[PDB]
Scaffold this active site. Structure first.
Site, mmCIF file in Angstrom:
data_model
loop_
_atom_site.group_PDB
_atom_site.id
_atom_site.type_symbol
_atom_site.label_atom_id
_atom_site.label_comp_id
_atom_site.label_asym_id
_atom_site.label_seq_id
_atom_site.Cartn_x
_atom_site.Cartn_y
_atom_site.Cartn_z
ATOM 1 N N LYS A 129 0.824 -1.206 0.000
ATOM 2 C CA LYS A 129 0.000 0.000 0.000
ATOM 3 C C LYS A 129 0.863 1.263 0.000
ATOM 4 O O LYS A 129 1.112 1.864 1.057
ATOM 5 C CB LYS A 129 -0.938 0.031 1.197
ATOM 6 C CG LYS A 129 -1.958 -1.091 1.198
ATOM 7 C CD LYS A 129 -2.825 -1.043 2.460
ATOM 8 C CE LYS A 129 -3.752 -2.233 2.467
ATOM 9 N NZ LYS A 129 -4.665 -2.230 1.311
ATOM 10 N N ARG B 204 -9.887 -11.905 0.960
ATOM 11 C CA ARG B 204 -10.678 -12.932 0.309
ATOM 12 C C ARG B 204 -9.960 -14.276 0.325
ATOM 13 O O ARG B 204 -10.617 -15.317 0.244
ATOM 14 C CB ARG B 204 -10.967 -12.527 -1.138
ATOM 15 C CG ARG B 204 -9.794 -12.650 -2.112
ATOM 16 C CD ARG B 204 -10.128 -11.961 -3.416
ATOM 17 N NE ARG B 204 -10.152 -10.528 -3.219
ATOM 18 C CZ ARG B 204 -10.496 -9.647 -4.133
ATOM 19 N NH1 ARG B 204 -10.856 -10.026 -5.323
ATOM 20 N NH2 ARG B 204 -10.480 -8.376 -3.851
#
Ligand SMILES: N[C@H](CCc1ccccc1)P(=O)(O)C[C@@H](Cc1ccccc1)C(=O)O
Ligand SMILES: N[C@H](CCc1ccccc1)P(=O)(O)C[C@@H](Cc1ccccc1)C(=O)O
Ligand SMILES: N[C@H](CCc1ccccc1)P(=O)(O)C[C@@H](Cc1ccccc1)C(=O)O
Ligand SMILES: [Zn+2]
Ligand SMILES: [Zn+2]
Ligand SMILES: [Zn+2]
Ligand SMILES: [Zn+2]
Ligand SMILES: [Zn+2]
Ligand SMILES: [Zn+2]
Lengths: 518, 518, 106, 510, 53
Positions: free
Chosen positions: A301, A378
């Site tokens: 990030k 996920r």
């Protein structure tokens, strides 16, 4: 169990406050039609002017005190208006010549307050409790509220009033004192009375989630988080099991374990169970995303607006689930068996991390090509979902700060719900309505499924083409629930209150309502 | 043979390799078209052009030993169709023996000398005919003029494109059978027959490289890669040596070792050797860049278009070299000694990684200032080149996915070749022509050399000013070959087939033709 | 059965074409959504006709998207046909609206 | 044509100095065998050590008692030969004449490169700039090709020539001492012509886009043509519209300056055996259009240089017009315009029609060069020439492929490409042959137009642009020189005038 | 002093095959008999700075 530390000043547990000042508040609810004694502390009227926008304040309640009564004569109050969120403070002497502080919060023109209006209302009331050393508040309700809203009023009042100082040391509030008593006047007293303690439980569940989320990642890591869950379970008499790396490996949870590979903290899978005393009519698996820190992994990030400094919050889903466990463990619903699950790990950058491109194998045998290590949620949920379904439940609901795209779709107020079952989605919706944690149904669009077709693995983790990443993430997750009603609540946009610079503990009440009304 | 270190037990400890591909089961038969076409079971395809007349009608020239098929393919019946490059049709009819046959054609355009790449389009059209259709037999009829190389190329490409890597398939295998017979009708068949088995070898070499490249970096790491090389050497009776870190340190390969410092996988230097039976007249060192994953290191691939997810492919050079070893080991050329070299490592981010700014010392004693950890390939190649030249070879050819600029210079079709020797470069260019792996000669511009003048070290790894990074990388490499003819093939642009989402195995044939035509 | 073999149910008023559509030749192909095959052949009239299928998957309810995939495959055959008529035979189950969508999309 | 003006202070033309100080220099060449005179000015030796960066040792015999002492080996041993290293001293000669003597380091390289020689000529130029001199004498104690000798000269003149036109001295004599000074004399005036062609291009390029706009640029070309006795024709928008040059005209739409198409012609006196069309990209400013150059590294401030191609072609016209080669007809062409943002600009997505009828889908307004060149190429081919060579600062990718030193040459004809390469060798303007890869052609297949201007997928944009250009030459040998990387000297903050010598050599040798 | 000193700790093949320092520095200045004290201070300052460098 034993939290690894790089230096002996690395903390080894999450500080938690169970016994809050809120809990010490002796609460009394009274029937409005018996009249309000205005005796001490602060006595706020919630007042609206139905119709006329920005109307006068007219205090309806009979007030059992000639002097407060004269003060509040429509004549005296006419100068003040009811613009939702306005407040005023009055200082006077009552009948026993005792100085009392009184006031009102404007509740608007619309005679039915929305969840967001009720919030703005509590906020006004909390700014009256801050910077004012009071032993007693009394709220006189001169508005129409249903039982859930008055519960919400209290939940929000408790949660907004509360002030997390766990991490304060030299900059604590030297001038902070809490009320010891809360008095509430309302119509139908007896009916609203039952909401009080529910509110208090809901408050704490939410606040407890809040505390976990807010705890920075050095405090709140997979080991310390799972420890906290075990501690909570013990306090609530819940069955608990923490799955460590060896068990995870035996269970072939490769997607989940791959995310944690880069962390100094071993993965910990949290499994709490609440079983009802009676016949079990409904089995529910609640799955929370439990990324204690999300650096992005090798897909760091680093991009502007990636908010890496916020990523301690990526276990909000897990927090929501734990807070819910608190509520369910406290309120003890019947005929339900609930599993509280979180595949907890930390997504870090290390020689040991998984890489973009890696093909990993989920516990259900599906091979997954990792397109982006920052789409780790996920992957963890995949294995959690396989696990949940192996439990043989009627419903699987996962809640996860899954996709930043949520900010672009629903924003910061409404969470997204996706799922494979309309009845289950509708149940979440109803629970949204009754918990006042806003949720919107979003579609799992099958047309996008094809973009998860990996050339080498069974499935891609991410789309290459489709930018509707919350939908794509849902499509991905759906592949891990074979035959159970399943819903996915993406609380990425809603979890953190950016304006207040704190978590919302979003989802605790929602999940609890869901469990309680099913 | 070394242990693949693992983080978790679910971490794979080898690259899965298919040696016996379905392509090895194809019985291939060439027949002279003079003799006429037996059209029976399976699919019988004609490759037809219409010289000069662009998208002109189809005409079948060849004799068909069947009144019925002949009649069917008579000119009057075939002019409804056109030969537009890559177009195809399927025909269905009952033959001389009351048997139903599948015949068809692939349009070969209007230019009677298909370029390498047109022929690629022709194969692809024919593959699509083989896909989704369970055939036991393909019979191809060349009604176009190709030469030995081009004919091979078609077989090699056909084989390659037909094959389908399902190694990382688990629940998503295709339920896919393969022809067990390839029939080829071509003029002067006897001259072409020899290409068949050469094509089959070339196919596998290429496909083998492809397998390695495609294997994700969790499967294909320095330890597992070198293990696979050892295995390949053992199968081919090649001498092999794998240099581990202790030996690398002894050899003072600091540039190479610095790259790998951040990896959990110890560097492994692959040294395979093929020596001819007879007198050795030529010694060749083939050096492949072997970065099993390139994260970029502290100069992390975080920029848009840096394609971090593709970086398992950064060992393509090593793959090409290994695939070449397979071909050479199999075809057993005479009078040559070939060394197959790759300094294998992984470029990762870690507390142990080398940093931008680090000054490191190559095995030839040159001190290098690291200006960007993402320019790691040249560092590993530096030490590999010094090693190569210490072998006393006549040629050193390195092949490497070295610079993303290649995409801007030559694009995805043609590799760049740079070198210090014209004769060697011409040999590569001839090899390009005969392998039909397109390569273009690019200059090493000495003017840029000065931008590698480090203020502190002997040399800078990267230019500060010059954006011509392929040329700069070449200048840098040149500094590590003192006195040997050396060429460098930059396959960064060409190695991955972005449209097909798979490696090309580029260079295996090129290098093998190079080796063989010497 | 996902990627199931092709099997034509309709009786067709042609002997050659019936032969071509028999289950033995048709099982060589699969129904993977959008997958098509098609051949040129002579019918009982020695007339030159083309015959094939477009696979519509393994779900008896096609979505719009799924239909679009089917149409797209058809439209492909179409752009390489100098034929005169298209005949589409629905061996799949489609309601009024989906059918209009099929036409509009085609 | 009257250049339009926003304000009374908007330059209406390009200042040009033709009579450069470099013309008032008399140049003499003495066989070094005869010995060296040190009379006046500065005398520089071009000395090399074929020991890496080794000691300096002067070879030539030198007619001065007092200076020969200065030149003694143990004095020079104090100095080194590293490329472009120099020292020079003042003293008194035999006749108490204040003479300066020094050397330039010619490295250890036996055969100087185009680059290494610039470094010699730059070191030397420094000393010329820091020193008020009557004469400079150059002594060649190294080996040089007649071409490299000529290169030395023009590089000297050009680098020495300082453009002072935009601001609010020089030696009057050049001495060369060279082994075989008879073979070299003819290179002198050629060098001088080449210098000026290059310097003239340079001048145009350097001129900012408020000075050098399509109207002023074409005006300047007309003036040059007139001075050179070249036939010239300037096509204005009415003629361009009649000719249906919609790709070219689209680009210019947003400009306050009407498009001007420059057509200069040199015809030889004798039988014409070769007809050449030289086409230069002539974007007088490239803003990017609606695809504005806003991205980091897009260097919008440099984009006055986007008429470098045109300048190269005009500079070449100067050389050709001056040297008057025989048996050639040369057309100098540039579709000049300015790529601006305006309510009138063409947009991304516009479909425009080139003069050959091909419709083009505009994928990016910043890929404007190829659009103008398209129409220029169709024009060129209509001329019925044997060769069309275009030169253009076409693609930033060139910086990533060849860098700043070598231009890229693409073409549809090997013979022609080889001719350019031969011209590169003899002009010492480095060019490299790059492929036109046909596989990429398909990415120019527009869904709506006949062709796309840009690729969507392929990042090999120099090759893609070439593919696009190829589409506009039907049946003529054609080469395209991408000088985008090479045109501007970033270090020296000036144009190089790249291509002038290349194109002139090409014309002169073929 | 500082600008004259080249830092070669990190070369090995690069030279420097020419680089050789003066052995003597002469200065001529007004009331030098005062400036003289600055010389060794400068040398200490040079090295402190060069050492940091
Ligand atoms: N916990 C992250 C999303 C939460 C969030 C909340 C507010 C602002 C930004 C982010 P994530 O796991 O990195 C999920 C990725 C999904 C993703 C990441 C990388 C490639 C594709 C999709 C994302 O939505 O950005
Ligand atoms: N193995 C990487 C390039 C391969 C590649 C292939 C296709 C697309 C992108 C990249 P690299 O070693 O990082 C080469 C560096 C070269 C470089 C040089 C100087 C500074 C940074 C990077 C690069 O191209 O990014
Ligand atoms: N006059 C520009 C090239 C000049 C140049 C030279 C060196 C560095 C930067 C720019 P251009 O026409 O915008 C060429 C475009 C090519 C292009 C093609 C398609 C889309 C965008 C840009 C470019 O390379 O930036
Ligand atoms: Zn993430
Ligand atoms: Zn996350
Ligand atoms: Zn790299
Ligand atoms: Zn690399
Ligand atoms: Zn542009
Ligand atoms: Zn331009």
């Amino acid at each position: 169990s034993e939290v690894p530390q790089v230096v002996s000043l690395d903390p080894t547990s999450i500080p938690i406050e169970y016994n809050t000042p809120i809990h010490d508040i002796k609460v009394q609810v009274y029937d409005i039609k018996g009249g309000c004694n205005v005796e001490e502390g602060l006595t706020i009227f919630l007042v609206n002017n139905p119709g006329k926008e920005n109307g006068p304040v007219k205090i309806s309640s009979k007030v059992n005190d000639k002097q407060v009564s004269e003060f509040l004569k429509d004549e005296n109050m006419e100068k003040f208006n009811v613009k939702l969120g306005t407040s005023k403070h009055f200082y006077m002497f009552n009948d026993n010549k005792n100085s009392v502080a009184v006031g009102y919060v404007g509740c608007g023109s619309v005679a039915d307050l929305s969840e967001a209006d009720m919030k703005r209302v509590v906020l006004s009331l909390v700014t009256m409790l801050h910077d004012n050393k009071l032993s007693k508040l009394t709220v006189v309700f001169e508005i129409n509220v249903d039982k859930n809203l008055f519960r919400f009023f209290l939940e929000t009042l408790f949660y907004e009033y509360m002030t997390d100082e766990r991490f304060k040391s030299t900059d604590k509030n030297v001038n902070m004192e809490y009320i010891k008593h809360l008095g509430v006047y309302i119509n139908n007293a007896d009916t609203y009375k039952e909401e009080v303690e529910k509110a208090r439980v809901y408050y704490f569940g939410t606040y407890y989630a809040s505390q976990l989320i807010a705890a920075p990642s050095n405090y709140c890591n997979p080991v310390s988080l799972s420890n906290a869950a075990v501690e909570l379970a013990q306090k609530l008499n819940l069955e608990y099991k923490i799955l460590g790396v060896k068990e995870l490996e035996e269970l072939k949870m490769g997607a989940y374990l791959s995310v944690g590979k880069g962390s100094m903290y071993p993965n910990k899978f949290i499994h709490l169970t609440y079983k009802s005393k009676g016949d079990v009519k409904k089995k529910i698996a609640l799955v929370g995303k439990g990324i204690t820190f999300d650096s992005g992994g090798y897909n760091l990030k680093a991009a502007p607006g990636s908010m890496i400094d916020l990523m301690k919050f990526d276990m909000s889903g897990c927090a929501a689930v734990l807070g819910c466990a608190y509520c369910v463990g406290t309120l003890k619903p019947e005929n339900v068996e609930i599993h509280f699950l979180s595949a907890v790990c930390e997504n870090m950058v290390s020689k040991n991390s998984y890489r973009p491109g890696d093909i990993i194998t989920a516990s259900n045998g599906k091979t997954i090509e990792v397109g982006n290590t920052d789409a780790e949620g996920r992957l963890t949920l995949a294995d959690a979902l396989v696990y949940a379904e192996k439990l043989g439940v009627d419903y699987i609901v996962d809640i996860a700060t899954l996709t930043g795209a949520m900010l672009y779709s629903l924003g910061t107020s409404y969470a997204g719900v996706f799922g494979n079952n309309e009845e289950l989605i509708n149940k979440i919706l109803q629970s949204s309505k009754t918990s006042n944690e806003p949720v919107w149904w979003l579609p799992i669009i099958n047309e996008y499924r094809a973009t998860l077709n990996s050339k080498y693995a069974d499935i891609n983790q991410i789309s290459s083409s489709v930018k509707a990443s919350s939908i794509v993430a849902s499509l991905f997750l759906k592949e891990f629930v074979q035959n159970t009603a399943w819903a996915h609540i993406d609380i990425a946009g809603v979890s953190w209150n950016f304006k207040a610079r704190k978590p919302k503990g979003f989802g605790v009440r929602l999940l609890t309502e869901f469990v309680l009304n099913d």
